Amino acid sequence: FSLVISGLTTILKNVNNMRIFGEAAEKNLYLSQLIILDTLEKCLAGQPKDTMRLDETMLVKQLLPEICHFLHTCRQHAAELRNSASGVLFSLSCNNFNAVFSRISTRLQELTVCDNVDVHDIELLQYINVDCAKLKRLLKETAFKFKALKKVAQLAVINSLEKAFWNWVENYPDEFTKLYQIPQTDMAECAEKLFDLVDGFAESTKRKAAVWPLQIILLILCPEIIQDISKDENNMNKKLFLDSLRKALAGHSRQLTESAAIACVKLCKASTYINWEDNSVIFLLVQSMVVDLKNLLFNPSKPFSADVDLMIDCLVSCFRISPHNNQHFKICLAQNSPSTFHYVLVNSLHRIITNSALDWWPKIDAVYCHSVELRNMFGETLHKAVQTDLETRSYKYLLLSMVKLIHADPKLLLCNPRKQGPETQGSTAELITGLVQLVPQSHMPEIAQEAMEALLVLHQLDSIDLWNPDAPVETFWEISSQMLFYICKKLTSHQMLSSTEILKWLREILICRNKFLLKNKQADRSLLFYGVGTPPICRQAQTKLEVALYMFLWNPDTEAVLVAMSCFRHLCEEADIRC
C-alpha cells in the first residue's frame, strides 16, 4: 500500500526529472514512463477502497507534478502519456477524491482573484471520476464561483463540467436514470443556477454557440422544467435558448448550425442514456429535432461539417432509440452514397458490436437483414489499392474499418446461403480468398496484420461452423487448402518482408486446423475421403506446407527456424490425430 505507492512515486518523479538530451533517450523514456504509469494504475485499481489512502495526501501532491509532469502545461507519445495519466487520476479519484477536490477548489479560488493561461491545475475535474453527490457539490461550487471569475475561467469550467457529466453518465449509468426517475431538488437548483450563469455569458454567436452544448445538458438535467417549457416567466430564457437551437438547426449560420447539431447529437446520446421505458417526453423532445439532424448529417447532397465522429454518434443513438427505424442505414447502403457514408455505417455497426452497456440498447441483431448488401459493398471495393490519392486513402481506411468490423464479428458477413455451386466463388469462399490476398500485399502493413488476425479470428471452430450449413467440414477443408496454397506459393516466392509474422500466423492456422480435425474425429471418425484417400487437394496442400517448411529452415533469419520446427511438431500431431 503506502510503501509501494511511495516507491512508485519516487521512481516516476526520478523518470520525469530527467534530461534526455539525446535522440533515442526521449523515445526510451516515452516507453518507460508509459510502463510506469500503467503499473501504477494497475496497482491503484487492485488496491481496495478499504485502504483509505488519505494518508497519501503527500503522494497525491507529488503526483500532481509527477502524474501531470507532461499534462500540466499540456503543450504521439504525449497522447499515450495523457491517456495513462487520465487512467491513473481516475483510479486515484476512487480513494483520494477529497484531496483532488480541495486542490481544484483552491485553484479555482486563486484563479478567480487573478495572463496567458491559468486553467491548468484548475481544469483537473476533466479527468476526475464523477459521482452524483460529487457532481452536485461541484455544481454548487461552480454556482458560488462562476460570476466572480474570468470569462476564460468560466469557459474552462464549462468545458470541464460537460465531460465530467459525461464521465458520470458513463461510469454510473444508473444515477443518470435515477435523476429522471426520482427527482433531486439540490441537483435541479444547481442546474438552474448554472443555466443562469451560462445565460450571463451570451455575448454573441460564438459565445452562444459555446454555451449551447452546456445549456442543452443543463436543460436535460431538469426533467420537470423541460416538460413545463412546452406548456412561466422564469422559464423564458430556456424557451429562448431552445428556439434559437431549432432555427440554427433549421438552416435559416454555418457555425451556429454546426454547434446546434453537436448539441442535438449530445441530446440524442443523453436520451439513449435516458430510460427507454420511461421516455418522460425526452424521446419526443429529441425526435422534435431528429428530423432536422437527419436532413443535416444524412443528406448526401448536403455536405457535412469531425463529420465522421458526429455521424457515427447520431447513427448509434438513432439505432439505440429506434432499432426498427433503419431508414438512415438503408440510405447509407446506396451506391450514390459517398465512401464516408459507408465508413460511418461501418463504424456504427462496429461500435454496436464493440463496447456498449447492456441496457435497453439493442444488440448486434436486427442488422443481418442487410448482410448481403454489406458483403456486396466490400466486394464492390474489390481492394482497388491492388485492383486520386484522396480516394485511394479513403478506400484503404474503409478497408481497414471493414477488417476491424470482421474482427469484432464474423457473423455479419457470413450469412451466405448462396454458396452451393459456382456461387460459392462469390460467397464465404470469395470473402476468405479476398481476405487472404491482403496478407501478401506490401503496400500497407497494418491492413495486412489486421486482415491476417481477422483470418485467424474466423478460423476458430465457432466461426468455422458458420460457413457451410450443409457440409461445413468439406468446404472448410477445401477453402483452407486454397488459402494454404496461396500462402505457400507466396512464401516460396521469397518476397515476404515480414516472413516471421507470416510463419507465426501460419503456425496458429495449422494449430486451429488440427484442433478442428480432432473435434471432427471425436465427433465422427470418418478429411478421410477428402485428402486421406487431380489428386486430393488436401494432399497437395500438405505437400506445399512441407516444402515451405523445409525452405524455412534454410532462411538466413534466426527466429524462423523455431517457427518451422514448431510447425513440424504440429504437422506430426495432425498426422497422429488423423490416424
Side-chain angles (χ1 to χ4, degrees), residues 5 7 22 24-25 42 44-48 65 70-72 78-79 85 87 89-90 92 97 99 101 118 120 124 126-127 129 133 137-138 140 143 146 148 150 153-154 156 158 161-168 171-173 176 180 183 188 191 195 200-202 209-210 212-214 217-221 223 225 229 235 238 241-242 245-246 248-251 260-261 263 265-267 269-270 273 290 293 296-298 300 303 306 310 314-315 319 323 328-329 332-334 338 340-343 346-347 350-352 357 360-362 366 368-370 374-375 377-379 381-386 388 392 394-395 397-403 405-410 412-417 421-422 426-429 431-440 442-443 445-448 451-452 454-455 457-473 475-477 479-489 491-495 498-500 502 504-514 516-517 520 523 531 533-551 553-554 556 560 564 568 570 574-575 579:
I5 288 167
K42 289 155 149 299
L44 294 152
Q47 181 155 328
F70 296 154
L71 276 176
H72 177 74
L89 193 150
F90 190 91
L92 291 169
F97 168 63
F101 170 70
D118 58 355
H120 292 313
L124 294 172
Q126 278 195 16
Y127 310 98
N129 178 34
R137 197 207 317 173
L138 269 297
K140 296 173 181 66
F146 204 91
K150 302 294 182 183
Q154 284 171 340
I158 284 171
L161 278 170
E162 75 190 303
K163 79 178 190 179
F165 150 72
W166 279 131
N167 276 116
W168 163 56
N171 308 136
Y172 293 96
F176 191 52
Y180 268 75
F195 179 78
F201 190 45
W212 288 343
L214 184 65
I217 279 159
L218 297 175
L219 190 41
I220 293 152
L221 288 163
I225 277 173
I229 286 158
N235 302 321
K238 290 168 284 294
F241 139 77
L242 289 151
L245 266 53
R246 312 319 212 124
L249 270 189
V265 167
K266 298 193 164 164
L267 166 66
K269 186 183 287 185
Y273 292 166
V290 167
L293 289 155
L296 283 171
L297 284 191
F298 310 125
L310 290 177
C314 180
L315 265 191
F319 166 77
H328 295 89
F329 211 76
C332 287
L333 275 72
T340 60
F341 285 65
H342 312 133
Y343 171 67
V346 163
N347 293 314
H350 168 64
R351 286 171 172 82
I352 284 155
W360 34 80
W361 264 92
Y368 292 127
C369 319
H370 290 284
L374 158 73
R375 85 184 71 99
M377 282 74 74
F378 93 93
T381 64
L382 207 69
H383 318 288
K384 297 288 99 175
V386 302
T388 307
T392 59
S394 65
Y395 292 161
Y397 302 150
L398 187 151
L399 196 56
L400 182 55
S401 62
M402 65 183 73
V403 169
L405 185 150
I406 300 163
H407 276 281
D409 199 49
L412 286 173
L413 293 90
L414 280 182
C415 185
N416 265 273
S427 293
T428 303
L431 160 67
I432 297 160
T433 304
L435 199 54
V436 162
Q437 294 161 310
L438 307 176
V439 184
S442 71
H443 296 288
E446 74 278 15
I447 67 167
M452 183 177 177
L455 282 159
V457 163
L458 56 86
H459 204 78
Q460 282 84 18
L461 75 164
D462 299 331
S463 301
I464 298 301
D465 304 320
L466 310 173
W467 289 4
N468 189 0
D470 319 294
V473 54
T475 306
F476 154 80
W477 285 123
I479 299 317
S480 311
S481 298
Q482 295 258 359
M483 61 79 71
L484 282 160
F485 271 52
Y486 199 101
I487 296 305
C488 287
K489 309 281 173 71
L491 280 180
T492 58
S493 77
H494 279 318
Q495 281 91 25
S498 312
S499 51
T500 44
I502 305 162
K504 295 172 184 290
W505 161 76
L506 205 60
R507 300 152 74 169
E508 316 290 331
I509 285 298
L510 180 56
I511 289 166
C512 299
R513 281 174 35 96
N514 310 338
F516 190 53
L517 197 150
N520 299 318
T534 186
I537 197 71
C538 167
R539 290 175 67 186
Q540 277 167 347
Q542 198 166 3
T543 301
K544 302 324 191 278
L545 186 151
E546 52 191 355
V547 163
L549 273 183
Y550 284 156
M551 300 265 168
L553 316 165
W554 161 51
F568 279 153
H570 305 328
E574 68 90 19
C579 310

